[PDB]
Amino acid sequence: TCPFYKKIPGTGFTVDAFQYGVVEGCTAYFLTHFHSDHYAGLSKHFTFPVYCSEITGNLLKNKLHVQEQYIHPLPLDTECIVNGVKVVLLDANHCPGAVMILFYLPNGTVILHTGDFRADPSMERSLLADQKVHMLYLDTTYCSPEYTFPSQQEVIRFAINTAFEAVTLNPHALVVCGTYSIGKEKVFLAIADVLGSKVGMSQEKYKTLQCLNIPEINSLITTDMCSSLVHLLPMMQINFKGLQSHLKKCGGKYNQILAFRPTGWTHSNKFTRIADVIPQTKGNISIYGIPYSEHSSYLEMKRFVQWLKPQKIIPTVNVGTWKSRSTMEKYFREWKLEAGY
Ligand code: NI
Numbered sequence: 001t002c003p004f005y006k007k008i009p010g011t012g013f014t015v016d017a018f019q020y021g022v023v024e025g026c027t028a029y030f031l032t033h034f035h036s037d038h039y040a041g042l043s044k045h046f047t048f049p050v051y052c053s054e055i056t057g058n059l060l061k062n063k064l065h066v067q068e069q070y071i072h073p074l075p076l077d078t079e080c081i082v083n084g085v086k087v088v089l090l091d092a093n094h095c096p097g098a099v100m101i102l103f104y105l106p107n108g109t110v111i112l113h114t115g116d117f118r119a120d121p122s123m124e125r126s127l128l129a130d131q132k133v134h135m136l137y138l139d140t141t142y143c144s145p146e147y148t149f150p151s152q153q154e155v156i157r158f159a160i161n162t163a164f165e166a167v168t169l170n171p172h173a174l175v176v177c178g179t180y181s182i183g184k185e186k187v188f189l190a191i192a193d194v195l196g197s198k199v200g201m202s203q204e205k206y207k208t209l210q211c212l213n214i215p216e217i218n219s220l221i222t223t224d225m226c227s228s229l230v231h232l233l234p235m236m237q238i239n240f241k242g243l244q245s246h247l248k249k250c251g252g253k254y255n256q257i258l259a260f261r262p263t264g265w266t267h268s269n270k271f272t273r274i275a276d277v278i279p280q281t282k283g284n285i286s287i288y289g290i291p292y293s294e295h296s297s298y299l300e301m302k303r304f305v306q307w308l309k310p311q312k313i314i315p316t317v318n319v320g321t322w323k324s325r326s327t328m329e330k331y332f333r334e335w336k337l338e339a340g341y
Pocket of ligand 1: 035
């Protein structure tokens with residue numbers, strides 16, 4: 001049964017609630033972004049409206065094969081009417097096509113649903129700046145003060161240098177990057193770009209990227225592996241046994257892989273900086289973990305919420321245990337008491 005934190009009061013709207021069957025009363029199903037926890041349940045056999053970004057639309061049409069009529073894409077940053085309710089989609093700074101949704105209720109209540117987001121100061125000068133938000137449905141993935149990580153730009157800086165160093169030291173080395181969903185495309189695109197290459201990948205991954213409205217994408221990616229010295233592999237595959245395997249397949253064209261595993265937070269964030277990172281090494285295969293996050297750090301989230309001063313906050317992540325719920329409320333109270341809302 002669809003939980004109360006996927007439902008928008010005073011509408012027939014639900015958010016990311018595609019895995020329960022028909023939800024009684026639901027006229028419209030919003031999808032914040034194309035990640036499988038959020039879309040779980042969609043298929044070619046959905047015959048209710050889906051509202052989503054253009055980019056999310058493309059992924060629904062081409063990867064899940066939903067029929068063009070049931071996908072309603074909306075532009076961003078545009079006041080739009082949806083069954084006589086004003087809504088706005090805003091960039092979530094998560095993965096490609098990811099949105100937050102502003103709901104303007106008939107009664108005068110205004111609700112923000114973040115989806116998955118990485119909060120940023122640029123959102124404080126968006127349409128959000130213009131009016132009071134009473135309710136906040138919040139991505140709480142990293143709602144705990146241990147959760148720090150560097151900026152995306154810091155990480156991209158690191159990766160670019162590492163890659164360029166080695167390739168200039170040994171020109172028969174291969175860069176590999178792990179991946180399992182959309183998100184984090186800048187890792188492999190920045191590397192490829194410093195190396196004078198396209199990125200090579202499987203046909204299914206190429207198809208996924210061709211939906212994302214990346215500009216000049218045809219000049220950045222290919223399905224021809226042999227021609228490319230930045231490759232993408234399934235994240236499962238980024239280990240010694242699976243890389244060794246892959247080092248064979250290229251057929252004596254490279255003598256060293258330098259792989260990057262973009263990860264979320266890991267406990268080595270608690271003791272080690274980004275400039276002081278190392279990889280695991282079994283012979284000629286070195287695997288970097290690099291903490292490129294597409295979710296708010298604790299401090300980023302804290303700041304966004306303290307600027308927003310919502311009358312009420314409803315968590316969408318880590319809501320499955322009473323301990324997490326109780327812990328999170330404690331942080332929301334401190335924030336509100338510090339900030340005087
Ligand atoms: Ni996500």
